[PDB]
Symmetry: D2
Subunit: 261 residues, 4 copies
């Protein structure tokens, strides 16, 4: 199969990449970063995020693999000492795949721009106060007033969603979680406060009240959008496919990253 | 069909019950509180909880309906003014049903006792300090130290789970959420802190460390269990079936109860 | 005495201002917005904040008064219906004063800039990730990693400090409170998480780790500072003096704003 | 001076106690556990709590010292390796003292019982639902509905108060902090949610609404009180006096216990 390898850019990740290319050169494996069926990221979860968005147009044709040359990552979750064994079983093929849900973010202008997120998408205010009306399935739910909102993927719950008090969902649950950032709550302004978990086909809409410019982020990318009229959140029909080669449970992956290792 | 009606016991709930029995007497409807196919609770969510556990041995043969004579409830969510229209469309039959996930709680002794919960099951310490080892899918996850733990159903997320910082899940998501109660976290003792959402077939086990007596609650019921050896939490294969007669979205039901009405 | 009146700028606040000037014209009261001893703000807490920072160079010579033409404010906490009675007892003089603590914020460059805050001062990152070392009384306390930090005055605890989970302090306590914004906590990075309350003379220092550009806010004002080397927080020796004319307890003021009114 | 030493009861704490008595026997130091001026606790913070309440009738005549034979404590905060140096400088006298605020808890029946707490006092419900009206300085503040309340001393903020989201106050601030336990908040029932910090002479009163039986705890002690009519919280006029022998800042003590050591 075709393959390619991204690297964090530091010394050890580049050297581990060339070592796997040399190991791949001993098999029926052609290097190709244009039409690959296997994408390997070496470095961290951020390096994996770049590899995902780099090939987010062909998600159904790629099995992703992450190698962490630093601390353990939730996507780059295979030690460098297992690089040589990764190459062989990848070269055989006939491995099983695992798929995670993704977040679909739509932005409408007075024009439309859609995005896909592996971790989360956030909405903050371009300087001024952040005020939006939250619409769930065409029903007005609340008028949010604070620092912003964060809609997280299941696997993204361990990232920014966790710092905002959100819960950690197992990535086999096709859903999305919304969390609040420093919400103002007084006798006249009311937010739900609790994080919200939405199943598939549930559409969460954010609609402006005053300023129509929001700082919208999607994973690592963050762009200021002007004259915004609506932000639509829903579980994406597209999924990301990992190459499963051993057994590393998500809760074990959560334990090693936050409890002890 | 056979039917029965429970009442909160106050004046208006009893009078609304006799009015529906009289309205039911004008149809092919026999009253029977032993083998009913339709159970109506009048009062509040607590009155509905009693009706559920009263017929929790025959959940697949009953469509539940809740009427709130007081404030809006998440299970008793139909106004008394709609009692006369409930009777007629219930008498016709040919309504659609909706099903919610339930929580299965297993307790092992040096003997076994299983339970079903509509909202949540909690574990606290019988006087002394609460210490348990949390085991997720036979893998040790953490050693919890605090006031206790709460495993909530999807519909139960709006109850005790909400007061503990847990997220609100849509009841169409077959899952269960675990929350922490006043967990102690220092340089040597570590808990995850974030709430955890577990899909079906995921088994969460609580195992004692010192004292084997815990105050285990299941919905409104709470019993002190002695010489406890294991507490097993998992999404139940059994479900509760409501009688759907109009359109009352869960998020609309959340809005009316916490934001404004 | 000399006096001046600021107004929110809308119709009713301007008309209430001219009405008090006319009422003041019936006494030994000269209007002067350069050297006043009594400053009246009409509008809201934001209008009061502007009046404070407008005369923050002469705080020991001014008694402040706030009138809310909208909802109740914690500084603008006197109804417009009491405007005519405010004018008379202000004209008599011989009222008692009440004083609140202020926050002193120092910023050092490779040059020094000091500021005074009535509510709080916040530190966020200019685009990139926010990382600082927190130094309390010259002892390294923690390496913070997240969205930012907020040091609040006692009276400022009801503002942004409250949205960040901070506690509400009575303004008679000469202290300052620090709160965290979306702090990242994993097995390798650790923050205290709890808000911290510091007495007088306690100096809290924030020191950069990578980027030396921070978005530093002080009350409503927010300015991007570049090549920052240190941010020093401490309870200010200066205080703000209100003109006490009735009895409005802080906890009563908290009750009317968040519980019910 | 007279002195006495309490011990956790395990082997090393008893042996360290007899070693200090033998070291004290080489000075003008008489052992006396009835009228001592110096009390030494060996073990942990719990052992120190027992020593405090054991001599809480003569707090103005005693300088307390805590030795931790296990992990670092906030009261037992001197290593066993410094036991021999503690004995000598204690025998010289002429050390400086440091004093911490205490919590005064009053309970009224249809009779009165007062208590002193070094960490905190908690109020929970004897089985049924916990509902109280919170009265601050004779003004009704809120109707609390949840699991209970916790009023903490400044030094007690690092204990149970920290697990409940409360802030950490420096013990030089004569104040008390109130925190909420799993408070229920819906459209009809409202709590402040934020922790509250009260200065001296501020009296916080809890008054029953239905059940007059509460599980009231004071530090380690916990007693069920029946037919309760009022619970009064205020900063105590009495203080605890430690024997200062080196320099161990409270924030350094917080750092070593929660961040790293
Ligand atoms: N706030 N904040 N947090 C930033 C986390 C950055 C590292 N990181 C990435 Br990039 N993705 C994940 C993920 N899915 N889970 C956990 N950490 C992750
Ligand atoms: N802590 N605490 N909270 C007690 C809530 C009691 C009322 N109540 C019942 Br009973 N069941 C539900 C439910 N599913 N959602 C919301 N309120 C509910
Ligand atoms: N986040 N956020 N919150 C902004 C609050 C703005 C209104 N406001 C002002 Br301006 N000052 C105070 C104060 N001291 N207490 C309460 N509200 C206040
Ligand atoms: N929940 N819960 N937490 C129990 C803490 C028990 C140990 N411990 C004692 Br006993 N007193 C203190 C104190 N003042 N600070 C920190 N830990 C303390």
């Amino acid at each position: 199969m075709k393959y390619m390898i991204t690297s964090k850019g530091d010394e050890k990740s580049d050297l581990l990449r060339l070592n796997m290319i040399a190991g791949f050169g001993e098999y029926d494996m052609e290097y190709d970063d244009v039409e690959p069926e296997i994408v390997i990221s070496i470095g961290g979860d951020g390096t994996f995020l770049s590899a995902f968005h780099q090939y987010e147009e062909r998600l159904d044709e790629i099995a992703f693999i992450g190698i962490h040359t630093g601390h353990l990552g939730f996507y780059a979750d295979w030690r460098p000492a297992e690089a040589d064994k990764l190459v062989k079983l990848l070269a055989k093929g006939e491995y099983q795949k695992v798929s995670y849900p993704l977040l679909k973010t739509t932005v409408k202008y007075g024009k439309e721009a859609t995005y896909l997120a592996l971790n989360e998408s956030t909405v903050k205010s371009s300087g001024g106060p952040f005020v939006v009306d939250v619409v769930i399935n065409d029903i007005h739910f609340e008028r949010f007033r604070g620092d912003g909102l964060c809609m997280s993927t299941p696997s993204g719950t361990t990232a920014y969603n966790k710092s905002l008090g959100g819960a950690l969902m197992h990535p086999s649950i096709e859903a999305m979680q919304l969390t609040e950032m420093a919400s103002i709550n007084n006798r006249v302004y009311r937010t739900i406060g609790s994080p919200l978990v939405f199943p598939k086909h549930h559409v969460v809409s954010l609609q402006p009240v005053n300023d129509k410019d929001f700082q919208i982020s999607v994973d690592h990318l963050s762009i200021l959008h002007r004259d915004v009229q609506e932000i639509r959140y829903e579980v994406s029909a597209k999924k990301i496919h990992f190459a499963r080669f051993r057994s590393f449970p998500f809760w074990r992956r959560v334990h090693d990253s936050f409890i002890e290792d």
